[PDB]
Amino acid sequence: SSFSFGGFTFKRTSGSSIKREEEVLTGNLQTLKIRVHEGYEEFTMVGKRATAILRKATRRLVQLIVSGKDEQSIAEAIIVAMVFSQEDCMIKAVRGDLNFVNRANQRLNPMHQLLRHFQKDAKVLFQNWGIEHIVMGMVGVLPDMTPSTEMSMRGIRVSKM
């Protein structure tokens, strides 16, 4: 499958997936009905200012190796990948005031609403994703997008263009 999401072209290089309509609770305990893809899948993400290799299991990001134009371009690709992963911590990072999802679908699907939400401000997302201890050529990236050699956002690596 070769599809479009958040301005990136996704192309599956390994794995398979079946769909399942499921109910998810946000950090605001809001119920969203999402189309969950089940199975280990590997994708290329090709955009205009960033490219990445995404390794993912059902509602879990295994690894994301990002290459881009700059910190903003890479953060963008990172956000799309985290929303696409359908991970619980991404969903649970939807919390606050006005931070709700219009349940009549209309303009955007839940995945497109989650995306439009994290594009506005990724602080809660990146900060609620987690950090892990960390290879030459690939650096780690902290939730504030600072490159580090000792810690990175879980599963996230930044490769040189």
Q: Which residues bind ligand 4EW (CB under 6 A)?
A: 1, 3, 5, 17, 35, 37, 41, 84, 86, 111
Shortest reach from residue 72's CB to ligand 4EW, in Å: 22
In this complex, which beta carbon is closest to ligand 4EW, that of residue 64 or of residue 140? 64
In this complex, which beta carbon is closest to ligand 4EW, that of residue 44 or of residue 148? 44
What gap in Å lies between CA 54 and CA 84, rounded to an integer? 10
In this complex, which beta carbon is closest to ligand 4EW, that of residue 39 or of residue 96? 39
In this complex, which beta carbon is closest to ligand 4EW, that of residue 50 or of residue 140? 50
Shortest reach from residue 149's CB to ligand 4EW, in Å: 31
Distance of CA 161 to the CA centre of its chain: 20
Handedness of CA 79, 81, 86, 88 (dihedral sign): negative
DSSP letter for 71, please: H
Shortest reach from residue 50's CB to ligand 4EW, in Å: 17
Shortest reach from residue 151's CB to ligand 4EW, in Å: 27
36 in Cβ contact with 110 (< 8 Å): no
Shortest reach from residue 17's CB to ligand 4EW, in Å: 5
What gap in Å lies between CA 75 and CA 83, rounded to an integer? 12
| Backbone region of residue 150 per phi and psi (left: phi > 0; alpha: psi in -120 to 50; beta: other values) | alpha
What gap in Å lies between CA 94 and CA 79, rounded to an integer? 13
In this complex, which beta carbon is closest to ligand 4EW, that of residue 37 or of residue 55? 37
130, two tokens: 């987690």
